[PDB]
Amino acid sequence: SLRDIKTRINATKKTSQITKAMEMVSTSKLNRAEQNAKSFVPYMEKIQEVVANVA
């Protein structure tokens, strides 16, 4: 029936909108998280060097 196809289109369109919204906010979160993880590398290296060379 045409109504079954049309109601399935409206539902799938709502899911597409929902998935795109979550993808972009996660993209924005990744851009910061990747930089944040990289920003702590010098601290993680310095602490590992002092604890290892002291122990």
């Binding site: 029936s1 109504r3 079954d4």
Partner: protein, 127 residues
């Protein structure tokens, strides 16, 4: 008869869809020119001349009443069809039944987010 004497009456039409089909048969065999979905142009006047007879009279006329519950069957959910849209426009409210709710275990199977009555509130009791 009951309305004209001050009493209350209820009238149910088991299916107006088969009644429209019966009129289509007579009109095509009598050679009246067809229209939308092969039906005669006269078909809105057929159901409106019927359903407008259900009314609540004034106190000077006796205060009597007649309420109607016509029924229509839709092919594969097509509410946009000729006879369905025609009778949806005549009535004071519609109850929509879904084949989907019925197999899912919502047993009376009424679409409460689509069904409507204009008289709602005025018809009910204060409680």
């Amino acid at each position: 008869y009951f309305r004209d004497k001050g009493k209350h009456a209820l009238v149910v039409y088991d299916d107006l869809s088969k009644h429209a089909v019966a009129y289509r048969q007579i009109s095509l065999l009598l050679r009246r020119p067809p229209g939308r979905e092969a039906y005669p142009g006269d078909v809105f006047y057929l159901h409106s001349r019927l359903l407008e007879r259900a009314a609540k009279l004034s106190d000077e006329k006796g205060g009597g009443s007649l309420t109607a519950l016509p029924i229509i069957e839709t092919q594969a959910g097509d509410v946009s069809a000729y006879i369905p849209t025609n009778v949806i426009s005549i009535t004071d409210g519609q109850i929509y039944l879904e084949s989907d709710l019925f197999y899912s275990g919502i047993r009376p199977a009424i679409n409460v987010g689509l069904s409507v009555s204009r008289v709602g509130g005025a018809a009910q009791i204060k409680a």
